[PDB]
Amino acid sequence: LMQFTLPVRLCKEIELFHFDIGPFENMWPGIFVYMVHRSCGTSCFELEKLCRFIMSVKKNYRRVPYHNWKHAVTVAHCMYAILQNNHTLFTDLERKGLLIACLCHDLDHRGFSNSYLQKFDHPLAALYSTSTMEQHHFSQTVSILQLEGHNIFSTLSSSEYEQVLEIIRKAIIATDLALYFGNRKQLEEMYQTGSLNLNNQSHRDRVIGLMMTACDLCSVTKLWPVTKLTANDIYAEFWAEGDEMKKLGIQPIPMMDRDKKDEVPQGQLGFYNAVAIPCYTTLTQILPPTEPLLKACRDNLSQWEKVIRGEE
Ligand SMILES: Cc1ccc2nc(CCc3nc4c(Cl)cc(Cl)c(C)n4n3)[nH]c2c1C
Numbered sequence: 001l002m003q004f005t006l007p008v009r010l011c012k013e014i015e016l017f018h019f020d021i022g023p024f025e026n027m028w029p030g031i032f033v034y035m036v037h038r039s040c041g042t043s044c045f046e047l048e049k050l051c052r053f054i055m056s057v058k059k060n061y062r063r064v065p066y067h068n069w070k071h072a073v074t075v076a077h078c079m080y081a082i083l084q085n086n087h088t089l090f091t092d093l094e095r096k097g098l099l100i101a102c103l104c105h106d107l108d109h110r111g112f113s114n115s116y117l118q119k120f121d122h123p124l125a126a127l128y129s130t131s132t133m134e135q136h137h138f139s140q141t142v143s144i145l146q147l148e149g150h151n152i153f154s155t156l157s158s159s160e161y162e163q164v165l166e167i168i169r170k171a172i173i174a175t176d177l178a179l180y181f182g183n184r185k186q187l188e189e190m191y192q193t194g195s196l197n198l199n200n201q202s203h204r205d206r207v208i209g210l211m212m213t214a215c216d217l218c219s220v221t222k223l224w225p226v227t228k229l230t231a232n233d234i235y236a237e238f239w240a241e242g243d244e245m246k247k248l249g250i251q252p253i254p255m256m257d258r259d260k261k262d263e264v265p266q267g268q269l270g271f272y273n274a275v276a277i278p279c280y281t282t283l284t285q286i287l288p289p290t291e292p293l294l295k296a297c298r299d300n301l302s303q304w305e306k307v308i309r310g311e312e
């Protein structure tokens with residue numbers, strides 16, 4: 001059969017956590033398929049269906065600075081790296097569902113936060129009172145799965161199918177950062193009191209949620225220039241949201257106020273300390289082979305420290 005392969009530098013570097021998928025959009029679908037094939041198998045999906053699914057997914061991301069198709073493929077690659085470094089800890093449905101969840105997790109994002117949707121009073125905020133965007137993303141995922149010739153899970157039983165979609169739903173909801181804090185605390189407590197049990201489905205769920213946050217934040221685990229340049233895209237969205245807040249006559253939070261450009265290095269520090277480092281710490285405790293993510297995050301915190309000290 002037909003193996004996907006990649007040029008040598010990509011073939012080797014794609015295995016690493018800090019891999020950057022590059023500026024060539026047209027290679028991203030091939031990169032994704034390569035990853036599905038090695039982490040799941042060449043038999044997981046019918047090639048024609050999968051290609052058709054990928055292209056509809058891509059069509060349904062919008063051209064926003066950060067929450068775009070490149071972000072989806074990046075988040076899927078980090079999940080790939082995690083799965084490949086812990087290959088025996090995951091069921092076959094999980095391998096199947098999680099890369100798909102990652103590719104789908106921000107479908108049809110508009111570049112605005114849940115909080116902005118609520119203040120604007122967007123129709124999505126009446127349809128979904130919490131995790132507004134994330135329920136929308138899962139909803140779009142189901143839509144695409146139901147298009148003719150797009151059912152990549154056709155080979156599964158009714159019940160396996162329901163299990164995979166339920167893995168996907170939960171993985172996608174977990175990318176709501178508001179939910180991450182409580183989830184990481186629970187996981188911390190269970191690991192430390194020795195009660196963490198991966199045969200317990202609700203424990204697995206929590207562990208998979210933290211994986212999702214880890215993959216979704218993975219721009220803080222890249223080479224410094226990738227990290228630094230991605231941060232620019234991240235703020236370009238947040239500041240456009242800030243302007244939109246001001247348009248509604250509401251003072252935006254400092255994160256989203258472009259008048260506070262100067263405080264970026266400091267906001268990054270808070271963010272690495274409150275969110276990123278704890279995320280990768282607990283992930284490393286639970287899944288030791290993911291330590292390179294923690295190590296890279298700490299390297300990048302150290303770089304933001306240098307930016308503050310005027311050494312950059
Ligand atoms: C003035 C002020 C106050 C509070 C702030 N908090 C930040 C962090 C923003 C942020 N958010 C994210 C997310 Cl959701 C993902 C990733 Cl991967 C990254 C790297 N980031 N970074 N900046 C702040 C500023 C400038």
Ligand SMILES: [Mg+2]
Pocket residue numbers: 105106133175176
């Ligand atoms: Mg999201």
Ligand SMILES: [Zn+2]
Pocket residue numbers: 071075105106175216
């Ligand atoms: Zn995301």
